[PDB]
Amino acid sequence: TTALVCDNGSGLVKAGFAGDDAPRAVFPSIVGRPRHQGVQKDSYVGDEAQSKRGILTLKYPIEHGIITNWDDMEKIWHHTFYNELRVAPEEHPTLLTEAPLNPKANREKMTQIMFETFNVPAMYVAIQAVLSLYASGRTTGIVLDSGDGVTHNVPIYEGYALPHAIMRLDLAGRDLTDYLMKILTERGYSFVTTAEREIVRDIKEKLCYVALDFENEMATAASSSSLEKSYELPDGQVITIGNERFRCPETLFQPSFIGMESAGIHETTYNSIMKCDIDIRKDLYANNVMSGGTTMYPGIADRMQKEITALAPSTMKIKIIAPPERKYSVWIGGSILASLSTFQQMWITKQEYDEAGPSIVHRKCF
Amino acid sequence: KTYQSRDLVLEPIQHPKSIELGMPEVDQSVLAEVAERENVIIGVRPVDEKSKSLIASKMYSSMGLFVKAISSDWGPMSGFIPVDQSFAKASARRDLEKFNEYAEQSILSGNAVSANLYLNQVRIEELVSKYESLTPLELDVDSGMYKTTATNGDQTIPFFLNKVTVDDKELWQVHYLREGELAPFKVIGDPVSKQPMTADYDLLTVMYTYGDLGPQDKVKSDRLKELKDVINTSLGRTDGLEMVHHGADDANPYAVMADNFPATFFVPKHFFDDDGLGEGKGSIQTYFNVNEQGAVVIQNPQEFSNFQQVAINASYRASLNDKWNSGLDSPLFTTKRKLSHDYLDARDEVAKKLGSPPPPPGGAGWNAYIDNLMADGTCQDAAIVGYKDSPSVWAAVPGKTFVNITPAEVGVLVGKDRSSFYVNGLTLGGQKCSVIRDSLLQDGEFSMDLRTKSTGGAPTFNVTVTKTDKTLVLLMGKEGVHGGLINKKCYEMASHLRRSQY
Ligand SMILES: C/C1=C/C(=O)O[C@@H]2C[C@@H](CC[C@H](C)/C=C\CC1)O[C@@](O)([C@@H]1CSC(=O)N1)C2
Ligand SMILES: Nc1ncnc2c1ncn2[C@@H]1O[C@H](COP(=O)(O)OP(=O)(O)O)[C@@H](O)[C@H]1O
Ligand SMILES: [Mg+2]
């Protein structure tokens, strides 16, 4: 029997089987229902909901890493099991991922849905950042996970996230796409609609990068064309992307670019380390692991290496690890964990759930 | 100089041999440049050696989709798909009705046209002199054509070749006796260019970098379609004479090792550097046969399996959205055999790294409670500690840590301040621990989860403390025991104690 691994992303669901090195299914975390509520299908999920966007209202049930609509989330899980993986959930132990600092009521509800709606024989809920740390071959370190709707700094000691020291940044890939649409619109172009947001998300993924020295790069962009790249729009028009290539992910280091008063990812990394025991801080500085789609920017690890070095004591050994597969490291970490023999001792069984109810997840999963 | 990664051992190629390929080397250079610019690994099925000059001429179209009539391997039609399938390979000649119907249906469905067959002077010299596929041409004074016969296939059939000028080119038109009368020989041609179809460049697989993997932008493969357009653009043929076609025909229940090998693979240039297969691991040309044009030649299934593993290890993978047949006579092509070595190494690393006392309810000694906690073999230490008034250990495992817990240590655990222990932890019987979760004030939990701190690579252990009306129940797991198992155990004992007013 194969365990299932479902990474409930704010923007993308990554799902598959434990023991595999990549998810079998990657699809948008959206649910689409017909616009007229006061009325040949009641609802649509993922790729099909996007294809039929002309007749449905689309919603993100996990917009900022936290599940807010349980009816839409159940539709996502049903789609994942039956339509993407084509499995009967009652035959497979299932590992689900959750956001760092996920509310107790939320993880209880997720546990109840798995056992009562899907009748899984066993399940476990793991924090996404912990799984990415496992995918790097580590059990202690600090993960910077930046996805679609949320970013977190998660320090981890021997497989256990330290919630008192977790930092959350309410800015991630979606906000970077919105900011890129704004600064391209400032040039006379128009990127405003949901469909235009998708074109700009493509521009962002293909041409953006993190500058090693932002002011130096801004000066270079203004004195030459050496950093310019051309992009062909769907209408055949050609747009030149210049300083926008590095101004867009600079927002991770300078959230004031989008009107946010928060510290940047390098400052929240330092703050998160400092909230941990003195004894572990050297191990965290030497094991900074980058994860998630919004850490894919070229230059991001060298910039984080420079920024953390500038903050830390000059003798501190600092290391940034940015795996090539970091877009899928949460999923890969879950596949690693659920394929180990120690996992059978960690899962919550239906018997345990029947005895203790949903609050069993507080005791067993951390 | 030997490549070693887990069970994959590659030894340097002693005396690299030159392997004959059907693809013109001008196009091999093009594909090597596309793999570099697009940052992809492209695999192309072998092209029949005898068709090289036909492709090199750049005069013909290539085999499109939905054509089930097969090519000929004899006569002047060698390398083309004759409309009359009696002129095709032996399998068509022994199933005429079946194959003639495939040729006719390809034309009737708008997937092909019936075209004249013109050959260049290079082709006539190859067939007569290089391959000796045709007998020497003899002028037939009445028609003005040259008569010849095939040296394989049906040797009794005469063919007639006529010198013609087609768009400033001196070519030879193929004629034959159709129902006894001289007629122009017809082959299956492309419906837009009208030119005969030769073999195409059939993509075996495409492996992309991680950044290019993921969900498609299909608002109803786009990346593979886009890559095929880049390939055709870089090949630079006249519009309509493309060598690569969008879409793909069925997998077909056929094997033949000559149809799959030698395959030509094209890779990003970083594979050719000294650190090609990793830091100080050597270049790809040290372990695989690569020619001057950058074509990586894969000769058999073991080499294909080894190449696929090196590519997977270097973070290049076939897409989820793409459909490939790639394999044929599989040695170990299953997903479980081709797992990334970074995946398997990380899993191995994680598996290694993860490893005046009042009378008790009943009135028969507190040691029985410790024995209960220690029975299932998951814990190395257990204790029941009174925390009210002057704190003291009521029961504990002898010679372990908890038996020495002090009132100062109890004071930190139950104290009003819930933040100073995040500076550098706390101690239990003198043992340094870090606080993982402080749920001491959470209703229905009343617990704290900790993990010991140790030196170098010495093992550390999970601890749970649960607070009842008068006691702290403390439990420490053995190496490798998960914190949730210990928390659940401590919770259950605390509930039992709370039920008996403890
Ligand atoms: C290709 C792809 C990528 C992705 O990351 O998609 C996810 C999910 C997606 C849902 C809506 C969209 C119209 C549907 C499908 C796109 C899926 O929204 C995102 O594109 C949002 C909006 S723009 C942005 O950067 N994130 C991210
Ligand atoms: N190459 C890339 N460069 C920059 N951003 C990227 C890249 N690839 C993906 N992203 C962004 O990453 C986000 C999706 O990442 P993911 O970790 O799957 O998020 P989540 O887990 O929150 O769903 C999107 O905002 C997407 O645009
Ligand atoms: Mg995520």
Author numbering:
A (entry chain A): 5 to 43, 49 to 375
B (entry chain B): 466 to 685, 728 to 862, 895 to 1041
What did the publication describing this PDB structure actually write?
While Pa-ExoY requires actin filaments (F-actin) for maximal activation, Vn-ExoY is selectively activated by G-actin in vitro. The catalytic domain of NC toxins can be divided into subdomains CA and CB, with the catalytic site located in a groove at their interface.
To avoid the indirect effects of ATP depletion through Vn-ExoY AC activity, we used an inactive double mutant K528M/K535I, hereafter referred to as Vn-ExoYDM (corresponding to Pa-ExoYK81M/K88I). Using this chimera (wild-type or double-mutant), we solved two crystal structures at 1.7 Å resolution: (i) VnEDM-PRM-Prof bound to actin-ADP with latrunculin B (LatB), and (ii) VnE-PRM-Prof bound to actin-ADP without LatB. In these structures, profilin is bound to actin-ADP, the PRM to profilin, Vn-ExoY to actin, while residues 863–895 connecting the C-terminus of Vn-ExoY to the PRM are disordered. The Vn-ExoY switch A disorder (residues 682–727) is close to the LatB-binding site in actin. (D) Structure of the nucleotide-free VnEDM-PRM-Prof chimera bound to actin-ADP-LatB.
